[PDB]
Write an enzyme that holds these catalytic residues in place. Sequence first.
Site, PDB file in Angstrom:
ATOM      1  N   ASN D  94      15.969   2.998  35.543  1.00 39.84           N
ATOM      2  CA  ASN D  94      16.633   1.994  34.720  1.00 39.84           C
ATOM      3  C   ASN D  94      15.712   1.277  33.742  1.00 39.84           C
ATOM      4  OD1 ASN D  94      19.159   2.446  35.874  1.00 39.84           O
ATOM      5  ND2 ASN D  94      19.001   0.748  37.334  1.00 39.84           N
ATOM      6  N   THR D 144       7.998  37.115  26.611  1.00 38.66           N
ATOM      7  CA  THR D 144       9.444  36.971  26.684  1.00 38.66           C
ATOM      8  C   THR D 144      10.120  38.106  25.927  1.00 38.66           C
ATOM      9  OG1 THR D 144       9.148  34.561  26.718  1.00 38.66           O
ATOM     10  CG2 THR D 144      11.372  35.408  26.304  1.00 38.66           C
ATOM     11  N   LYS D 146      12.718  39.766  23.586  1.00 38.68           N
ATOM     12  CA  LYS D 146      13.482  39.332  22.426  1.00 38.68           C
ATOM     13  C   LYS D 146      14.370  40.472  21.936  1.00 38.68           C
ATOM     14  CE  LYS D 146      11.252  35.443  22.480  1.00 38.68           C
ATOM     15  NZ  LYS D 146      11.885  34.214  23.033  1.00 38.68           N
ATOM     16  N   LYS D 148      16.277  36.674  22.060  1.00 39.85           N
ATOM     17  CA  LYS D 148      16.540  35.793  23.194  1.00 39.85           C
ATOM     18  C   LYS D 148      17.800  36.233  23.926  1.00 39.85           C
ATOM     19  CE  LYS D 148      15.959  31.345  22.497  1.00 39.85           C
ATOM     20  NZ  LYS D 148      14.684  31.120  23.240  1.00 39.85           N
ATOM     21  N   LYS D 172       9.395  38.438  30.911  1.00 39.56           N
ATOM     22  CA  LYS D 172      10.306  37.410  31.425  1.00 39.56           C
ATOM     23  C   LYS D 172      11.629  37.299  30.676  1.00 39.56           C
ATOM     24  CE  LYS D 172       9.527  33.058  30.368  1.00 39.56           C
ATOM     25  NZ  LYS D 172      10.632  32.916  29.455  1.00 39.56           N
ATOM     26  N   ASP D 174      14.356  35.126  28.733  1.00 38.60           N
ATOM     27  CA  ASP D 174      14.321  33.865  28.009  1.00 38.60           C
ATOM     28  C   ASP D 174      14.966  32.772  28.852  1.00 38.60           C
ATOM     29  OD1 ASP D 174      13.462  32.648  25.478  1.00 38.60           O
ATOM     30  OD2 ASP D 174      14.001  34.588  24.609  1.00 38.60           O
ATOM     31  N   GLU D 175      14.545  31.529  28.607  1.00 44.08           N
ATOM     32  CA  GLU D 175      15.033  30.416  29.416  1.00 44.08           C
ATOM     33  C   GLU D 175      16.552  30.317  29.381  1.00 44.08           C
ATOM     34  OE1 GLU D 175      13.134  29.971  26.570  1.00 44.08           O
ATOM     35  OE2 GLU D 175      14.990  29.687  25.439  1.00 44.08           O
ATOM     36  N   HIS D 265       9.998  27.395  34.040  1.00 41.34           N
ATOM     37  CA  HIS D 265      10.125  27.130  32.613  1.00 41.34           C
ATOM     38  C   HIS D 265      10.493  25.664  32.412  1.00 41.34           C
ATOM     39  CE1 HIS D 265      11.607  27.227  28.493  1.00 41.34           C
ATOM     40  NE2 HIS D 265      11.028  28.408  28.352  1.00 41.34           N
ATOM     41  N   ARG D 266       9.814  25.002  31.469  1.00 41.87           N
ATOM     42  CA  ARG D 266       9.986  23.568  31.255  1.00 41.87           C
ATOM     43  C   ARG D 266      11.014  23.246  30.174  1.00 41.87           C
ATOM     44  NH1 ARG D 266       4.384  21.654  28.123  1.00 41.87           N
ATOM     45  NH2 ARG D 266       4.594  23.085  26.339  1.00 41.87           N
ATOM     46  N   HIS D 298       4.723  26.404  32.107  1.00 44.59           N
ATOM     47  CA  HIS D 298       4.265  26.377  30.727  1.00 44.59           C
ATOM     48  C   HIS D 298       3.555  25.062  30.440  1.00 44.59           C
ATOM     49  CE1 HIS D 298       6.934  29.809  29.158  1.00 44.59           C
ATOM     50  NE2 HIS D 298       7.139  29.741  30.461  1.00 44.59           N
ATOM     51  N   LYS D 305       3.507  27.791  17.864  1.00 47.76           N
ATOM     52  CA  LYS D 305       4.595  27.216  17.087  1.00 47.76           C
ATOM     53  C   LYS D 305       5.092  25.889  17.645  1.00 47.76           C
ATOM     54  CE  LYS D 305       8.226  29.778  19.557  1.00 47.76           C
ATOM     55  NZ  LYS D 305       9.132  30.959  19.515  1.00 47.76           N
ATOM     56  N   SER D 350       2.480  29.878  25.840  1.00 42.47           N
ATOM     57  CA  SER D 350       3.512  30.704  25.234  1.00 42.47           C
ATOM     58  C   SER D 350       4.070  30.012  24.002  1.00 42.47           C
ATOM     59  CB  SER D 350       4.649  30.983  26.227  1.00 42.47           C
ATOM     60  OG  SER D 350       5.653  31.801  25.646  1.00 42.47           O
TER      61      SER D 350
HETATM   62  O1  LIG Z   1      20.511  -1.808  39.370  1.00 44.06           O
HETATM   63  C1  LIG Z   1      21.278  -2.401  38.587  1.00 44.06           C
HETATM   64  O2  LIG Z   1      20.919  -3.111  37.617  1.00 44.06           O
HETATM   65  C2  LIG Z   1      22.789  -2.280  38.806  1.00 44.06           C
HETATM   66  O3  LIG Z   1      22.991  -2.119  40.177  1.00 44.06           O
HETATM   67  C3  LIG Z   1      23.414  -3.570  38.282  1.00 44.06           C
HETATM   68  O4  LIG Z   1      22.955  -4.608  39.072  1.00 44.06           O
HETATM   69  P1  LIG Z   1      23.764  -6.129  38.729  1.00 44.06           P
HETATM   70  O5  LIG Z   1      25.254  -5.846  38.758  1.00 44.06           O
HETATM   71  O6  LIG Z   1      23.287  -7.058  39.831  1.00 44.06           O
HETATM   72  O7  LIG Z   1      23.139  -6.412  37.365  1.00 44.06           O
HETATM   73  C4  LIG Z   1      23.302  -1.026  38.032  1.00 44.06           C
HETATM   74  O8  LIG Z   1      22.694   0.117  38.593  1.00 44.06           O
HETATM   75  C5  LIG Z   1      23.022  -1.097  36.510  1.00 44.06           C
HETATM   76  O9  LIG Z   1      23.892  -1.942  35.823  1.00 44.06           O
HETATM   77  C6  LIG Z   1      23.124   0.317  35.910  1.00 44.06           C
HETATM   78  O10 LIG Z   1      22.511   0.275  34.677  1.00 44.06           O
HETATM   79  P2  LIG Z   1      23.270   1.411  33.551  1.00 44.06           P
HETATM   80  O11 LIG Z   1      24.557   0.703  33.176  1.00 44.06           O
HETATM   81  O12 LIG Z   1      22.194   1.394  32.474  1.00 44.06           O
HETATM   82  O13 LIG Z   1      23.427   2.716  34.301  1.00 44.06           O
HETATM   83  O1  LIG Z   2      11.850  30.878  23.828  1.00 46.20           O
HETATM   84  C1  LIG Z   2      10.695  30.919  23.341  1.00 46.20           C
HETATM   85  O2  LIG Z   2      10.367  30.467  22.228  1.00 46.20           O
HETATM   86  C2  LIG Z   2       9.629  31.597  24.222  1.00 46.20           C
HETATM   87  O3  LIG Z   2      10.244  32.668  24.860  1.00 46.20           O
HETATM   88  C3  LIG Z   2       8.493  32.065  23.309  1.00 46.20           C
HETATM   89  O4  LIG Z   2       8.924  33.217  22.675  1.00 46.20           O
HETATM   90  P1  LIG Z   2       7.730  33.889  21.589  1.00 46.20           P
HETATM   91  O5  LIG Z   2       6.689  34.351  22.607  1.00 46.20           O
HETATM   92  O6  LIG Z   2       8.462  34.981  20.825  1.00 46.20           O
HETATM   93  O7  LIG Z   2       7.269  32.733  20.727  1.00 46.20           O
HETATM   94  C4  LIG Z   2       9.123  30.567  25.274  1.00 46.20           C
HETATM   95  O8  LIG Z   2      10.194  30.184  26.089  1.00 46.20           O
HETATM   96  C5  LIG Z   2       8.453  29.329  24.633  1.00 46.20           C
HETATM   97  O9  LIG Z   2       7.113  29.526  24.325  1.00 46.20           O
HETATM   98  C6  LIG Z   2       8.546  28.137  25.600  1.00 46.20           C
HETATM   99  O10 LIG Z   2       7.948  27.069  24.963  1.00 46.20           O
HETATM  100  P2  LIG Z   2       6.767  26.207  25.973  1.00 46.20           P
HETATM  101  O11 LIG Z   2       5.921  27.383  26.445  1.00 46.20           O
HETATM  102  O12 LIG Z   2       6.067  25.250  25.034  1.00 46.20           O
HETATM  103  O13 LIG Z   2       7.613  25.564  27.056  1.00 46.20           O
HETATM  104 MG   LIG Z   3      21.481   0.078  40.519  1.00 42.65          MG
HETATM  105 MG   LIG Z   4      11.977  31.401  25.823  1.00 44.19          MG
END
Ligand SMILES: O=C(O)[C@@](O)(COP(=O)(O)O)[C@H](O)[C@H](O)COP(=O)(O)O
Ligand SMILES: O=C(O)[C@@](O)(COP(=O)(O)O)[C@H](O)[C@H](O)COP(=O)(O)O
Ligand SMILES: [Mg+2]
Ligand SMILES: [Mg+2]
Lengths: 99, 99, 438, 440, 438, 440
Positions: D94, D144, D146, D148, D172, D174-175, D265-266, D298, D305, D350
């Site tokens: 939060n 990866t 291609k 994709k 691999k 592709d994601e 994969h991230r 990764h 790129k 990558s």
């Molecule tokens: O932790 C808190 O703050 C709450 O329990 C509210 O407490 P109160 O009712 O005592 O303020 C809720 O989770 C948030 O409102 C959610 O925020 P969002 O709307 O950003 O998901």
């Molecule tokens: O989808 C793509 O672009 C790739 O397959 C690269 O292909 P190329 O090898 O043809 O560029 C990888 O997933 C990225 O590198 C991921 O980015 P990161 O590694 O930064 O998470």
């Molecule tokens: Mg809460």
């Molecule tokens: Mg990829």
Amino acid sequence: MHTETFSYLPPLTDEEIKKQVEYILKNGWIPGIEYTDEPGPHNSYWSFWKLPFFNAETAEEVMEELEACREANPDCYIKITGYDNIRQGQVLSFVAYRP
Amino acid sequence: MHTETFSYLPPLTDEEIKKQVEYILKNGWIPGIEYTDEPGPHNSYWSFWKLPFFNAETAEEVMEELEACREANPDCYIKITGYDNIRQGQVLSFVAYRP
Amino acid sequence: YEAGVRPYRETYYDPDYEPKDTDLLCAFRITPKPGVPMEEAAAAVAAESSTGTWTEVWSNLLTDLERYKARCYRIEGDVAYIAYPLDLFEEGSIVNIMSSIVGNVFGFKAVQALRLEDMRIPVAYLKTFPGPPTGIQVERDRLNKYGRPLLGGTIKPKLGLSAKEYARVVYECLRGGLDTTKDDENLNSQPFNRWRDRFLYVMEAVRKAEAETGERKGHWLNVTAGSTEEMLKRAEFAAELGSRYIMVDFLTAGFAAFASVRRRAEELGLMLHCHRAMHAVFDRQPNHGIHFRVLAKWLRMVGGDHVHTGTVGDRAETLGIADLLREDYVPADPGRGLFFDQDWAGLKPVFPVASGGIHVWHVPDLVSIFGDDAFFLFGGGTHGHPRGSRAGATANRVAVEAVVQARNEGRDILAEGREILEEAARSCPELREAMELW
Amino acid sequence: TYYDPDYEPKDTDLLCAFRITPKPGVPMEEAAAAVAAESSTGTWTEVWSNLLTDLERYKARCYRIEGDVAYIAYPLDLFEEGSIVNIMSSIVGNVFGFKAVQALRLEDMRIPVAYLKTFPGPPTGIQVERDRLNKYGRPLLGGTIKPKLGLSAKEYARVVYECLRGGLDTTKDDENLNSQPFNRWRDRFLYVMEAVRKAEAETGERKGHWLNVTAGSTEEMLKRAEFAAELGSRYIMVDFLTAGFAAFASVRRRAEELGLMLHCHRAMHAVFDRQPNHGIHFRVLAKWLRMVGGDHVHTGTVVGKLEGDRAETLGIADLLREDYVPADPGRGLFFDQDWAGLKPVFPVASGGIHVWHVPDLVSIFGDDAFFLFGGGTHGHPRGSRAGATANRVAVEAVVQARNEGRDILAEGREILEEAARSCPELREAMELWGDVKFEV
Amino acid sequence: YEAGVRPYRETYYDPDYEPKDTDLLCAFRITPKPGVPMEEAAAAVAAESSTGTWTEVWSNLLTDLERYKARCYRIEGDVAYIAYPLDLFEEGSIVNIMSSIVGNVFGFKAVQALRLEDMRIPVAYLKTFPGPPTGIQVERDRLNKYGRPLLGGTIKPKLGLSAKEYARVVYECLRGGLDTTKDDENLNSQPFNRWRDRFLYVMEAVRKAEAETGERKGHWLNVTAGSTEEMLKRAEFAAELGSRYIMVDFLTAGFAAFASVRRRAEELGLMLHCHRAMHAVFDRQPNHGIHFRVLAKWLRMVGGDHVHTGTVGDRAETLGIADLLREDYVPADPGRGLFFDQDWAGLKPVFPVASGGIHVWHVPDLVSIFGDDAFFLFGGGTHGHPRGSRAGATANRVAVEAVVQARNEGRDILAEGREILEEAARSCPELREAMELW
Amino acid sequence: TYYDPDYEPKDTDLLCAFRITPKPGVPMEEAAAAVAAESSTGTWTEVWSNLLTDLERYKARCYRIEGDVAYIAYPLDLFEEGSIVNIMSSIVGNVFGFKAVQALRLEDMRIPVAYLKTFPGPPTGIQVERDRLNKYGRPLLGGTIKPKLGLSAKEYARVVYECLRGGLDTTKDDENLNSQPFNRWRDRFLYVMEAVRKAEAETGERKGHWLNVTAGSTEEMLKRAEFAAELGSRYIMVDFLTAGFAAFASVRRRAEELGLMLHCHRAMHAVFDRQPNHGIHFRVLAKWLRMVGGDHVHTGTVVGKLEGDRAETLGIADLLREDYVPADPGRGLFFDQDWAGLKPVFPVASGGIHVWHVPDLVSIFGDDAFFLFGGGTHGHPRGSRAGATANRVAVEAVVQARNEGRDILAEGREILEEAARSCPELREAMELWGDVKFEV
Ligand SMILES: O=C(O)[C@@](O)(COP(=O)(O)O)[C@H](O)[C@H](O)COP(=O)(O)O
Ligand SMILES: O=C(O)[C@@](O)(COP(=O)(O)O)[C@H](O)[C@H](O)COP(=O)(O)O
Ligand SMILES: [Mg+2]
Ligand SMILES: [Mg+2]
Ligand SMILES: O=C(O)[C@@](O)(COP(=O)(O)O)[C@H](O)[C@H](O)COP(=O)(O)O
Ligand SMILES: O=C(O)[C@@](O)(COP(=O)(O)O)[C@H](O)[C@H](O)COP(=O)(O)O
Ligand SMILES: [Mg+2]
Ligand SMILES: [Mg+2]
């Protein structure tokens, strides 16, 4: 051993092969050449001769590559492929040369 | 024991009830009357007083049915309902009379 | 075939393209790297979120890129409109949508900042999603509550309190007239407060408050845990105890595990409150991230029964989000950040939840904004009452009911909000006190 | 009281370094105190039930402020054991949407050893993975497939076959390739493994393909992991952020049970780890990744790129691979980090890289890393097999040069040109991409 | 509300209604009872297949009939067009479609005869269906067979033959060049031929023929059984033996059990041949029943890899059915009985199967009609060869390949069909013999 | 040889009566022989493998022809034990599309006792069902909830409550109500059972609702049956033709295991049992239904909105309820049918009936039947409760009159008018629908 399409007909002459290549090109498909010394039910990835000829404009250009593959690999089965990228699948495959 | 909507306000007068009925009708919803001697968390089907008043055109027509239900069932809780057939659900329900 | 690098624009920018009704559409706010034209930055986003990469590959000619590629079909100001063919997506998988639309394109050197503003989910793809396991109408039926907003509150302190006592606060809130109470999003199972203990004693308090008041009650028991299996275990136990509700932090747990809990919840007959903890990590800045309205759409698609919507971010923005959660069709309105029309294809509606330091004085505005179909949460607004949680719950309940009554009678609850509350306070000492405190 | 500059952190405390942009008029000291309160115990009004507890045992404390950076310590008992989900719910749950801060970035986190021991870490780890592959002394090669999306299962595995038989160790999905109308996962998994076995037998080197089990539910991901194991695959792949940490933990447990190595994969990380004013720095995500248990993740390329800073990337690689990483301001490491014996993770570079980047990549990462060439493999003028050979040869030539005592940065081009004399595939790759540079 | 009976026409005939893209459309050929107007008969079908009944009910006013009711929106000749809102149907359930569209309306006294001719399945509903577990393209990949029709044949006598011998006939057919062989639709497990025995010995014959010829082979092992559990058991055993195929009588087993087998088949990697036994009970008469093209659509939606299409019913009719099975979009053409356009929303295509007393002389016509993507079955056309199954299989294989070669060379295989076969017969004694016999 | 007028059928033979419309020029004798061959062994050309068998043991034989009716006998060993699916595949699998016949209708089938013993029959049966309900001496009352579709789960169960508390024994989901956006099955199942329990406690009579488990797959139907049993429901419902016989058998087995009584809806039957020249007569479908095991099945009303002949319906009721049914040309019963001790099935009369039809319905069916009033209950001027009372009272008044020795057809109107004097609900129903008649 048979090699699927056309293997139950007499071996194809170069002019028959060329007509099949013309059929592949006329329909806008991509002709290719593959070869292997180990045909059979367990082999679904023959060796590529270069890449699929995306840029080939005439059947004779393909036939020249066939003759070069045939000269380079005289002891291998060699097949012509036809690929349809709209279908994402081969639409024709037949052995052009047998060792 | 509380009976949900408006049960934390003072008991409604007939003129307050009528205004709630007018709110139901003005929005094109169907007013209804139900009653039970066993309110509580386990009762989700009170007794129908007649059917939902699909044909009611004025709040007073509903109020006359309320008075008749109230006279017939003096020892029961009696609630007004408002049904929205486009939503397929009740949009308002409150107890109008308590024994 | 020609090897080498080509501009993304040559293949993935197509201002002649007419989007199909089955296409998934995205509106990206794009800040290009200085020196990179907008058309190239937009085409890069389209390419690297669908089919393309940084250099031409022979295998491109083995498929039908005209059919499968995403296309930037319109650039207006700094907003790029991109259309994605339906065939690119896995049916029923929000995870797949994310992996494409927001997978890598936010980290390209050529695009200095990128913000996904809105997404048009096509009707044909929405039908592969189940939607909320309960929905507003069925939820009101299960509760037997009609004609007013529903009230809740978070049991506090956030972290620190023990179990049988944590449940005494629940009992007091619910016996005072709140419909629900809830765990804090970060209350899972900790040395100070283990989940099995809390579940057992919270539910004893719910049954007691329900029996005494005669109104159906619930507590949003947080099943959020480190693995999907553990969350399902805690949901099963909540169901075994007769809880009507469970709660999940759907963003911190993640969408894949969220989908698993949503399925089990429907199987067990549990209603699913969804806490949006972590959303501001994604959606806070206007130049980069994902706006919450997109997260809300994915939330309704997977299937949550409620989700927090904030307090009043912006009013226009909140009204748009409330419509996206509740209506069957929402027309576009860029003033509210809605860049596309959104047909919801019959998916059940989601309860919006207003929470965050709200008290009796805000009820007239909240009823005007949301109407009946919403949850109003009073966390500290219940426990901080001069006479404790019970009296605070009564003040809040009376305030809501009094305002609803006035609205239904034809009174202007905005211009008469103060007068309405003071009228109701004359017959409710708890309300009069609460109004004096805050 | 939530700001306490006299508080000395405990070895059991969890520590956070926040970069705070407070709402105008909110001073830094008060904004830091607000973050500590909302991420631990604090409320917005006094409550009667607070008197039934001892909140001092659970309060987080900001104990140091320098500029716009606040250091905050959290007691060990605030957190659920073994749950990254709980960490996120508390630390980034939060406080990023709170009104009194306009922007907030979590720069770093000191995971105490006592909390790390509640996590299993990677299911395989660098050492055991190299043992399973029988590959020692060089970065490992991948790429990866291609396009994709859009390839059929059978044609997809053709590209895999060409890559692996040409010298890549792995390939691999592709994601975003999961299971789609043009390519369903069961079809892909079967055909890919036929290609993997074929390339392994023909080359004599052990191969693998990172089969993406990412799916819409945990149950579906586990099903796809089961099928990969039934096919004898050495690897599966998961997008751990888009799938989420709870389902990621479930998949990691199953992976170890089935003997599968787990590529991570991230995808989505740049949504919130890119901008310097708001979000979560990737180094924090990398720590969480190593705790749950990924075998690779990764880390960026620096020169490719996608954006990535060299110094920050050096620190992240150390965080993933070493058992102790001292603080280092030059690399953005705010805390010393002991890893309590958890296995190390392979960094993966990558994205938009090709042969000319290999000297830089070896210099940055050393041997313990994967270098992925997708477009840089399939984009070779003669296709994927030639491209794979070019990349494998470039990596080995540079490793050899380094081991012989050469400065691979100063002689980077010369080294590649020497190797190209005996490898026409490398020569053709160098010619094609010679003028393709990204900003560093 | 007014109790009593009203004509169906007042509520369910709406010639002003404009069908939505999400509506499911039906074209019914209606023969009203003499004295019953066409508009009333059509409205009765619409009413009693959606929301209505024979008398007004108070509960009608508890829902939104304007939203949910089916509507006859056009009557042309004796064909009634009826539109069904998408919300009326359960996602992914052919059984639900049938329970509404063909549940009761065929038995009303007011409608003397009723024939469902065609149905427009909307794209948004199609996406809730999985489609074929394999599909033409993937099936050809699994077989490594490209560029010609595929050949099959039913092992005969239909019922009577034993197991190790039944398998000798399979071996002879497949070693002669047929790609597949199959069980008869009514061969399940019987005292003369039990399924476990047949499965074991048939597969030994398949492995042997595949090893000797070098071409991948299969037998369509019939798993049709009295319960879904028993069918799944027989499919598991077929998979354990390494069979690439199983077979189900999808109409006699039923769609619910069909859906169960289709799921298991995909899980097990089995390809699913679908036999249409019983179809003529439904689809034979032009005045009453369900035309096969509707059954074919439901078949492709649930997911079959092949289905029989007949021999050549009518040519125009068969070309329409082949398009419905194979294409991604099929425009309307009432000449072929296609009353609506049908978008297939990316569902995989189904192999059409031509079977029924066909032999070498029919190959030129069959190739002209179907092209490459079809199965040609030669049951008795293989075993009835003068020199047995092996020689008959060779004659059929050569005939197909020879005709395909001529077509690809640019020859008119219809005008030169005879000449082509006689040319090929000069180098294939088996073909010359087969042509003399039949 | 497939026509053998000297063949004497065996008690183990399965017998069929086909009405054949041969292709012009195809004489009846040859068409019957063709049907026998294609439904047993025959082929279209000589085959070498026929010589390795004794086909005479498996040939079907047409042994009698009268007019356009052919009697055909099938050996017991042709069929798979306990599989109605196999019967259909053989008997109605291909002979209906054969070229030499223009139309074909299966009129009747003699199931031999030796084949019947391979089937379990109904899971409950009339006698045990009446025991479970504690209801003896009258037809049982039911009704379909209307509108067919569109009601929410909670409002749907309100109508159920009003019906059951008013005197109906049961209520049912419409055949096409399964699980839809406006009404999901779990919601409906829960609310309906609350109404069932409520009406049972208030009236003192045992109640039930036929919850439709019909779904797109067998597994889903079994899941819905499980949930119905967990709620304590006495009944589930299945559309056995649209779901199909294989999935129907699976549901019937589970129903017995769970203790559920099984209502069977014949949706789709009229697609092929209506026209006298082509299809399968319903009496055959009724035999198959009783063999697999349904506790009830719809049989038509004769007098209602759906077509049905009185004489044929009398024979079908006997086929469903008796242990032996002799042949009867007047009712279309071509064969004697022994039922080998299989339990009997409740006939169900439903569709467009109201109070005025009760004398006819009692006369046709007697006590062992369900009478369903959907529109005839909810369409009552004062709603579903009053309508249910009117229908219950009409049925009981007519049963009483019959038992006292009255001719309920000759005095039908008088009987109803007498009962109406003590039942205003019946009086109002008689007034509303007094002029609503269908052709018989
Ligand atoms: O932790 C808190 O703050 C709450 O329990 C509210 O407490 P109160 O009712 O005592 O303020 C809720 O989770 C948030 O409102 C959610 O925020 P969002 O709307 O950003 O998901
Ligand atoms: O989808 C793509 O672009 C790739 O397959 C690269 O292909 P190329 O090898 O043809 O560029 C990888 O997933 C990225 O590198 C991921 O980015 P990161 O590694 O930064 O998470
Ligand atoms: Mg809460
Ligand atoms: Mg990829
Ligand atoms: O039993 C048979 O007749 C077949 O095995 C053909 O045998 P032959 O190849 O020996 O004729 C097929 O099942 C029918 O063709 C199917 O009929 P439909 O096309 O009507 O489904
Ligand atoms: O859908 C219907 O029409 C019904 O619910 C009748 O409703 P009403 O009671 O309102 O007529 C029944 O399913 C039919 O009687 C079935 O026909 P059969 O019994 O001939 O199979
Ligand atoms: Mg057959
Ligand atoms: Mg019905």
